Structure 1
Amino acid sequence: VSLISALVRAHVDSNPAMTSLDYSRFQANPDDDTQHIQQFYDLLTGSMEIIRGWAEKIPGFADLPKADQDLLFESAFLELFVLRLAYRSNPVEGKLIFCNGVVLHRLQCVRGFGEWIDSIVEFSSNLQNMNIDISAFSCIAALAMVTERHGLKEPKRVEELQNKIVNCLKDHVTFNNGGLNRPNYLSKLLGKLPELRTLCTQGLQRIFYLKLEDLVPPPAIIDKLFLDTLPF
């Protein structure tokens, strides 16, 4: 199996299928609930598990020390939640498609996600305007996780894996352009990664707000990851 094939499989097998989406909760025009907050947390915790399975399907990832795996996964989690949500969704219709296949309107997400959902949809729109095929996306997603972080036990190995993925992506882009390079396109593509950082911080801000509001406290796994991430 080629590396890009393995990256595509990791992506496809960790995303809901277009042929089995769940519309049973969707409302194009719905009518503060503790319910919306709870669901917001459920969507984050359900997504953690699926992204963890995705990460374990990236060749080389399971070869890293357990601490390195945890560091990479935990540091990238919210970025990945946003990236994959934005790729899967239908921003023009205001349709968010979560990793379990549940389709919800933007207006349904507003009570749980606050403003952050609006930032997500905007980024989705910008991302989809770039016409990133499945193979290129699979590489980009991997690169949001397989990246330099401070305090890795095997940073050279992470860097080699990063470089292998970058080279897949490069060859893929060039091949799909009939053998000519697209170095500016590749730049714009990799430029989507720094933009995920802002979206991550906005997700942290939402959890911060909900924790302070204290109507529904975050569940232990979110609380722990949230608190451990804080510089204070």
Structure 2
Amino acid sequence: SLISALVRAHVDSNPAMTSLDYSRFQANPDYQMSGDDTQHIQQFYDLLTGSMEIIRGWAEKIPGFADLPKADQDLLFESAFLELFVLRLAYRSNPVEGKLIFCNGVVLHRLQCVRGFGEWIDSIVEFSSNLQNMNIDISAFSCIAALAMVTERHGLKEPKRVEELQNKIVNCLKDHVTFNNGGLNRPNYLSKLLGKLPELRTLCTQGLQRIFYLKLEDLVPPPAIIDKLFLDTLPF
């Protein structure tokens, strides 16, 4: 029941792997680089806001989420955007070829993303390599994604409703794993999957550091949506 909804949410919020536009894909480094930085910082901001709208649409397809106070929805979405963005990008990209595929089908090489993202893009590619080396199926990935957002957050109006949705999702992922791979559970696999979440939070704080650096540089000032994201995500 829940995993079907979660997988449909994922599928509906991801680009079909046949519409990948390799038009702005450039793999020659000598050409990969010489574009003034301004354009890359803007490209960075656009990728972030474009995936903000995509992922919010995904979040709205999570059974039970929409029944939560609108303020809780905004707190969960803003608190997890960076983690969602990093997880979804790392799951659909191709780390071995150094190819990044964003929430919209654009395929860029790592060396092109380094100009805008900073070293964080390398931390992202390493995360993609680690995540894919454990070959999570789509049902499991849709559950981890749901659990990355539907989790405890300070300043929540109704924390018990969220806690209930989280338990529902955790239990759904455990049932899928146990049924799929024999009546005998895989507690160790399960713990590695849930352990992928803290790594995601850190990748995120590393995204806040990249945004903070760009705000200080003041060359390509962060647009209103990124300014708000930065201030709203600040944990203190």
Structure 1 equivalent of residue 139 of structure 2: 135
Secondary structure in 1 matching 2:220: coil
Which of 220-229 and 126-135 deviates more? 220-229
1:95, 1:105 within 8 Å by CA — same for their partners in 2? yes
Long gaps (5+) in structure 2: 31-35
* Matching of residues 59-208 of structure 1 within 5 Å: 59-208=63-212
> Residue deviations 1:81-133, cap 9 Å, x none?
00000000000000000011000000010000010000000000000011100
Normalising by structure 1, we get a TM-score of: 0.97
1:80, 1:144 within 8 Å by CA — same for their partners in 2? yes
> Residue deviations 1:49-78, cap 9 Å, x none?
000000000000100000000000000010
Normalising by structure 2, we get a TM-score of: 0.96
CA distance in 2, matches of 1:78, 1:197: 8
1:143, 1:162 within 8 Å by CA — same for their partners in 2? yes
Structure 1 equivalent of residue 33 of structure 2: none
C-alpha deviation, 1:231, in angstroms: 5.8
Which of 3-12 and 172-181 deviates more? 172-181
C-alpha deviation, 1:225, in angstroms: 1.8
CA distance in 2, matches of 1:37, 1:217: 9
> Residue deviations 1:169-205, cap 9 Å, x none?
0011111212210001100000000111110111001
C-alpha deviation, 1:153, in angstroms: 1.3
CA distance in 1, matches of 2:74, 2:218: 28
2:7, 2:138 within 8 Å by CA — same for their partners in 1? yes
**Aligned length, in residue pairs:** 231
Secondary structure in 1 matching 2:152: coil
What's the C-alpha RMSD, in Å, of the aligned pairs? 1.0
Structure 1 equivalent of residue 16 of structure 2: 17
2:15, 2:103 within 8 Å by CA — same for their partners in 1? yes
C-alpha deviation, 1:156, in angstroms: 0.8
C-alpha deviation, 1:44, in angstroms: 0.1
2:78, 2:232 within 8 Å by CA — same for their partners in 1? no
CA distance in 2, matches of 1:224, 1:164: 31
CA distance in 2, matches of 1:167, 1:227: 33
1:73, 1:145 within 8 Å by CA — same for their partners in 2? yes
Residue in structure 2 matching 1:222, options 197, 210, 226: 226
Q: Which runs of 4+ in 1 moved over 4 A?
A: none
Identity percentage of aligned residues: 100
CA distance in 2, matches of 1:150, 1:120: 27
1:86, 1:124 within 8 Å by CA — same for their partners in 2? yes
2:20, 2:105 within 8 Å by CA — same for their partners in 1? yes
Secondary structure in 1 matching 2:18: helix
1:29, 1:107 within 8 Å by CA — same for their partners in 2? no
1:45 aligns with 2:44: no
CA distance in 1, matches of 2:189, 2:129: 17
